[PDB]
Design an enzyme around this catalytic site. Structure first.
Site, PDB file in Angstrom:
ATOM      1  N   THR A 121       1.210   1.974   3.309  1.00  0.00           N
ATOM      2  CA  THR A 121       2.415   1.685   2.747  1.00  0.00           C
ATOM      3  C   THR A 121       3.785   1.688   3.139  1.00  0.00           C
ATOM      4  OG1 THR A 121       2.180   3.713   1.479  1.00  0.00           O
ATOM      5  CG2 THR A 121       1.275   2.134   0.261  1.00  0.00           C
ATOM      6  N   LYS A 164       7.445  -0.434   3.644  1.00  0.00           N
ATOM      7  CA  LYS A 164       8.628  -0.024   3.732  1.00  0.00           C
ATOM      8  C   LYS A 164       9.580  -0.484   4.898  1.00  0.00           C
ATOM      9  CE  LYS A 164       6.571   4.087   1.640  1.00  0.00           C
ATOM     10  NZ  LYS A 164       6.403   5.552   2.199  1.00  0.00           N
TER      11      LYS A 164
END
Ligand SMILES: OC[C@H]1O[C@@H](c2nc(-c3ccc4ccccc4c3)n[nH]2)[C@H](O)[C@@H](O)[C@@H]1O
Ligand SMILES: OC[C@H]1O[C@@H](c2nc(-c3ccc4ccccc4c3)n[nH]2)[C@H](O)[C@@H](O)[C@@H]1O
Ligand SMILES: OC[C@H]1O[C@@H](c2nc(-c3ccc4ccccc4c3)n[nH]2)[C@H](O)[C@@H](O)[C@@H]1O
Ligand SMILES: OC[C@H]1O[C@@H](c2nc(-c3ccc4ccccc4c3)n[nH]2)[C@H](O)[C@@H](O)[C@@H]1O
Ligand SMILES: *Cc1c(COP(=O)(O)O)cnc(C)c1O
Ligand SMILES: *Cc1c(COP(=O)(O)O)cnc(C)c1O
EC number: 2.4.1.1
Lengths: 810, 810
Positions: free
Chosen positions: A650, A654
């Site tokens: 993840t 970002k």
């Protein structure tokens, strides 16, 4: 100042000011003459918190009246970070609070830096839960996050002599203004004991009781007046506990230790009793709360229409046999009906295929701690295997492979198998990972029940990970396409129309430069480290693990250094290489990797011949608040795990949203990111999953690469000989030995392609305009990676509820 | 309703109402539809607390500007009880809050019953500290109470099968709205280590550190706008503490156990390491705070002009060598100058002469835990004994008697001797006790330094112990003589003018009857016990101890029972005999006495022939809040300790102020109470101190009394034979054996006189008008026993400061 931060109306600013002064006086019991910045932070936090209250009460009232289906997200980890700014953002209060504090003679940015991260997670899995809560509230779902209120979260990392040291994260020392204790809703949790069989069913008796006391934290949706709850349980001893006298009172700590500390291992299972107690504690307390709320709406056939339980990995898997226990032993449902209810209520998300991360609990532990649950697990297994035998008659090896009970030296329960048997849906977290699940570790289960298996690609919340951490970028975007994209991130596609717009190109590049200057400044202030803000900021931040291959990055850094030393007067694109992350305290190889990184820095950063063409910095104490500072400053995002090992990632998402280009393997969600942006706009290198399988089949021999690549041989000789550790020449022998003889992650196999790909990165950085154009193409196609998209898919495809963007009345 | 409760103005009532609603919403996060009485209590507490804030801040500001001499009252115990009503009383808010809550549909009395006692003491000594804080604030002294914030106070007592059971007092479970944590003023405390001697003095090194975190509680004066502070320290581990990983975090409890639990022994020394840690912890943290505040006014010659430290018994005696340590080792004062400062700063109050209560710490414990303090104590002793030798040349036995170091099997430090040597004043707590100190245990010290020895007779605060607990009596008094007596209790003498006033006599008797009805009702509600409200309420409430002679009371009760059984149809004044108090958990004989009392009740209360002429009730869980209910209901106060054993007593004073007559020995303050009221108005019986000495000289033989008093022999035969324990006939053998062969407190010696005196009580109760007239004479002369009088004497005669009744501006 900036539009996306909302309005600073005179009436509001005036009211915030007087409420700030009221809290400073009545709440903190201070006058302005002795108040410190910390007191000012608290006064602001209480002022903002007051705006949540009405909405929180009315939201929960609304769910009571409407009685919607409720979503219970069970996790042992919630990595929330700081709450003040997020709350202001979601309530549209940022500009007004900025104005109010400025009028009071205070800098709000300064006050924000005082707040402690709520660090109740290790990394990606915990932070996913936090993004999910934000998205569930933004989409208007009646959703509850349930976990444990650890007294100590993930440890604070100090670097001493280049080595990691751990110190306790006493995050509650000054109080937590964002929680509300609810001692009135305390519930009992049972441990140990024995089972007795009566004429009327089984009874679990002679148990030890620990109390679970809830603390509630509000979770505001984005400008929709919805405020959901995260309820975290704290362990308390009963007052007759152990009740010479003094010792009995001191021994209360045995019970209260259950909620004391977060286990600090990422992607690694440690089968300790205290951890099992934590897992049952959260499950047992949570399920009582669920049933209570359901009864206050006698017939459990409607239970799955009113309740969904989502298991964040197997850590809360005991929910399955606990629900059966309650339904069979306490409510007197027949087994078959109870199992039907359970399966339809529960769903399971898997986040890893690494064998050492899978939970396999020794039977002797469950036998002592949770004797009735073990009986139930055995009964589940027998019935499940009867189904398997009927479907695949005579296939005895399938029976042993699929069993929940693993045979061997010590018998264990495979909790993943339990979750699959007891859930109506099982999902992975990125398309390639979900495929891997069906082709390898859960193949047998997929053949029995194909309909259970799904994919739900992960996402991140664009509130925290764009608007909050990168207001400059959010603003230049809103200027072109309005503000709607903040809750509909697919609107970023509109930015492709600006890829040839000279003004936009300049603005995107300007925002990155400003972020880099600000971060360079932060480095000097809090860590007295100097860096060249015109260099390419090459960053790898994530937990330290062999599978994530920080070591591969190190090999490239040393390659760069050696090439400079060989031709000092040749031009090379200047880089600042930043690597950060925590190592699990017991993970020796990870701690050695940290020491290698600082050791490389010690040599490289002080070599006059290098100058400021290359700097290697280890970013200490990586955590959510640090991610919010460094990710907006990054040019290059390193996402370089061995193909097949990073379930999704993840951090990758970002960086994409914040204007960095990605160098990475075709692993986890990197695959889908490249698909969305176009492979031409991504720096892809290395083995694919199929290539890794081919190599394993013939046998990975690291010596071959060492023998054929002179630049690699040179590095290994440097490591072995003591070049990076003069006083302790054999300091890195464990590393060399692992690389040469037992590297499960094939670092040498991707080295050549990685180095060549890094050269293409450097070449593109030399052309600012084309670098920025490629950045715009990445930002523009990052919409799929919003956790709003992810949660909408869980809602429609697993939970059976419809999202809503409709506002409740303020 | 009643005048002494203050005004209920429209503006105030209106404002209390809206602030109550504001706290219910914003502070408690509830709406009226789900709020419980507990939530309503909290909303009221926060509403009242808000009125303290301005006064608290301005009081402490005032001390900073004026720089008065500061008084530091150090105690290991502060028995505060409930805070809500006391706060309303002292701020004149009671009637207004009553009106506001009534308008909201709530009964304020009901809400008051929800609050937990702050039970951070054992009994008299702890409660004295609490009355003292109230008086110091009422008299305008710059006074600070310093202690330990125990997580668990004095245990809750349950009676099961007639036996005491203990359960932890988890008083903080729902939060404490009256404290403010001050984590910013956390200070380090050192333990263990070793001493190293340098060229420049001694240095205490290699210590373990525990942090002391303060919590501040306001202490309002009576209607003078002064709000002083009680600062209680809580133990916290440092974050690098012990810093495999998990175990190191769990082991933080070792350090934090220091503030976990109050030692539950009254008048009994238990020499455990944890207790010594508690004593040093409070002293070390407190002294740093004292010095800090003094420096923020370099020359310590002024220290005693700006600081007084009062030691509540020897429990904080380590203040003496700690102050020397700081002055000599840290500030570099020469020894002689440091000692001069220390002596002039410190004063010591003794509260007991019982040998088993005196603190004598083993040298080996101090040696390990506090090595530098032991060195200092040795040096103090050498210098002190050099003075003794110069004053009393050749008197070698005096040298051994006066030494701080006791020789023997195990060497110990006598902490009382240390306190006398290191204090400029030493006082007892009632005239006879202070005399006893000079004639017996401290005789040698009195001969060396006569000027040090003083008396300060104890007192009680008439706010809590009249206005708060007995508003009916306060009102009928105020009607005649105005309200001024509440802060000048000597004005009660004016009531002697009403001793023949028929209306007053009737009103006093009416208030007692109302109190008795209310208490009788409480008994039925919360404990399902029925009592005759027309009987004489004969009450003995205090800790259970052999010296307090609950056993003598028991012998009278059995005598009464036996006399009824002998002549069933003869009239006797009906009595309800109530006995309550806690036994220390390890004090076997005290636990046996509780069981005897309930055993007597089991027989007496169910004998049809007795009817309701005699009832024996054990009052469970005696504590400050229960005292506030039972003392106003009492007719007869039992104060029957062996002469010479109760240093003062303070329950005695509470009963006198509330309209009970006293039956008692000439012990402690009973002597002064009889002197004030007149011996004719007190039921005095038994041996005087001189009689006890005479008996000890010839030898106490209990057999003599058994042989000569047939009613006593009968009781002992009943006890031995199993009359009060049918199924366990020898249950009370330990009691009989103690009474007959090793009774240190001479129970049989006062039996005859006690019984005869009880007959005179009964005869007077038969004449209501003359009973009440004698009651008026007691209430009227109770003024000397206000703690305002006591504190004024400490201020003028020990601390060197003048009290003030002047109001600060609101
Ligand atoms: O209730 C939990 C905490 O309650 C605090 C307290 N918190 C609140 C409160 C009140 C409103 C809130 C609104 C949003 C989020 C949190 C909120 C918390 N009221 N009282 C006490 O100050 C603390 O010791 C206690 O642990
Ligand atoms: O799905 C969210 C993230 O979950 C991470 C993850 N974290 C864990 C994890 C986290 C904590 C654990 C604690 C005990 C035992 C096993 C544990 C496993 N498993 N998987 C994945 O590595 C990442 O690709 C991913 O994006
Ligand atoms: O500060 C100590 C407590 O602080 C509470 C808090 N207390 C106050 C406060 C505020 C005003 C007060 C006035 C008088 C007495 C006590 C008072 C306490 N403000 N904040 C938090 O709610 C609790 O968790 C924490 O332990
Ligand atoms: O002066 C206040 C009261 O102090 C009581 C008192 N309490 C203690 C006491 C209290 C607690 C103790 C703890 C450890 C060791 C010794 C201890 C001694 N000593 N004296 C006296 O018995 C009583 O007459 C008296 O009125
Ligand atoms: C996003 C995030 C992670 C996950 O990063 P990956 O690169 O996907 O492992 C870990 N830690 C923190 C603090 C984060 O914010
Ligand atoms: C006053 C009081 C005491 C002291 O009573 P004595 O009879 O003097 O021992 C003990 N406990 C409580 C709760 C009190 O209020």
């Amino acid at each position: 100042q900036i539009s996306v931060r909302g309005l600073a109306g005179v009436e509001n600013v005036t009211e915030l000011k007087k409420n700030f002064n009221r809290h400073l006086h009545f709440t903190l019991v201070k006058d302005r003459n002795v108040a410190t910045p910390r007191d000012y932070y608290f006064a602001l936090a209480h002022t903002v918190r007051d705006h949540l209250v009405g909405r929180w009460i009315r939201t929960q009232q609304h769910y009571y009246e409407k009685d919607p289906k409720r979503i219970y997200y069970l996790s042992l980890e919630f990595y929330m970070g700081r709450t003040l700014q997020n709350t202001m953002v979601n309530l549209a209060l940022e500009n007004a609070c900025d104005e109010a504090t400025y009028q009071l003679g205070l800098d709000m940015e300064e006050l924000e830096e005082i707040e402690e991260d709520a660090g109740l997670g290790n990394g990606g899995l915990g932070r996913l839960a936090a993004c999910f809560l934000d998205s569930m509230a933004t989409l208007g779902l009646a959703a509850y996050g349930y976990g444990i209120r650890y007294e100590f979260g993930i440890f604070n990392q100090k670097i001493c002599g280049g080595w990691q040291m751990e110190e306790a994260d006493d995050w509650l020392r000054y109080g937590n203004p964002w929680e509300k204790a609810r001692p009135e809703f305390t519930l009992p949790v049972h441990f140990y004991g024995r089972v007795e069989h009566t004429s009327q069913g089984a009874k679990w008796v002679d148990t030890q009781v620990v109390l679970a006391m809830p603390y509630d934290t509000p979770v505001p949706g984005y400008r929709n007046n919805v405020v959901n709850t995260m309820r975290l349980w704290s362990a308390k001893a009963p007052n007759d506990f152990n009740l010479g006298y003094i010792q009995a009172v001191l021994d209360r700590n045995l019970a209260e230790n259950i909620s004391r500390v977060l286990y600090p291992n990422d992607n690694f299972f440690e089968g300790k009793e205290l951890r099992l107690k934590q897992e049952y504690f959260v499950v047992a307390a949570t399920l009582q709360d669920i049933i209570r709320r359901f009864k206050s709406s006698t017939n459990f056939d409607a239970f799955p229409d009113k309740v969904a339980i989502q298991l964040n990995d197997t850590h809360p898997s005991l929910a399955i046999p606990e629900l059966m226990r309650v339904l069979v032993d306490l409510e007197r449902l027949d087994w078959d009906k109870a199992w039907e209810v359970t399966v339809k209520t529960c769903a399971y998300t898997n986040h890893t295929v690494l064998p050492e991360a899978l939970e396999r609990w020794p039977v002797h532990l469950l036998e002592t701690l949770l004797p009735r649950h073990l009986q139930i697990i055995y009964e589940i297994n027998q019935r499940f295997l009867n189904r398997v035998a009927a479907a695949f008659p005579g296939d005895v090896d399938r029976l042993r492979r699929m069993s929940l009970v693993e045979e061997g030296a010590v018998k264990r329960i495979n909790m993943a198998h339990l979750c699959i048997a007891g859930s109506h849906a099982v999902n992975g977290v990125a398309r390639i990972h979900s495929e891997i699940l069906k082709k390898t570790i859960f193949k047998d289960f997929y053949e029995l029940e194909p309909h259970k298996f799904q994919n739900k690609t992960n996402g991140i919340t664009p509130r925290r990970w764009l608007v909050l951490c990168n207001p400059g970028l959010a603003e230049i975007i809103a200027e072109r396409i309005g503000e709607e994209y903040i809750s509909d991130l697919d609107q970023l596609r509109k930015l492709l129309s600006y890829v040839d717009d000279e003004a936009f190109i300049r603005d995107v590049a300007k925002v990155k430069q400003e972020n880099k200057l600000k971060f360079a400044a932060y480095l000097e202030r809090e860590y007295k480290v100097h860096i060249n803000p015109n260099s390419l900021f090459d960053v790898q931040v994530k937990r330290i693990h062999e599978y994530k291959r920080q070591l591969l990055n190190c090999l490239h850094v040393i390659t760069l250094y050696n090439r400079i030393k060989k031709e000092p007067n040749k031009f090379v694109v200047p880089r600042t290489v930043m690597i950060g992350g925590k190592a699990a305290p017991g993970y020796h190889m990870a701690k050695m990797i940290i020491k290698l990184i600082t050791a490389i820095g010690d040599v490289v950063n002080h070599d006059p011949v290098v100058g400021d063409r290359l700097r290697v910095i280890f970013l200490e104490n990586y955590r959510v608040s640090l991610a919010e500072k460094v990710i907006p400053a990054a040019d290059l995002s390193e996402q370089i795990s061995t193909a097949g090992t990073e379930a999704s990632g993840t951090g990758n998402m970002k960086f994409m949203l914040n204007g960095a280009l990605t160098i990475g393997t075709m692993d986890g969600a990197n695959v889908e990111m490249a698909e969305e942006a176009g492979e031409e706009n991504f720096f892809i290198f290395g083995m694919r999953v199929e290539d890794v399988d081919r190599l394993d089949q013939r046998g990975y021999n690291a010596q071959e690469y060492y023998d054929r690549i002179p630049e690699l041989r040179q590095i290994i000789e440097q490591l072995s000989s003591g070049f990076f550790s003069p006083k302790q020449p054999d300091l890195f022998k464990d590393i060399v030995n692992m690389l040469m003889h037992h590297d499960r992650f094939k670092v040498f196999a991707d080295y050549e392609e990685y180095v060549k790909c890094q050269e293409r990165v450097s070449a593109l950085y030399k052309n600012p305009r084309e670098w920025t154009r490629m950045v715009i193409r990445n930002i523009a196609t990052s919409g799929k990676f919003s956790s709003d998209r992810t949660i909408a898919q869980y809602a429609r495809e697993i939970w059976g509820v419809e999202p809503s963007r409709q506002r409740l009345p303020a």
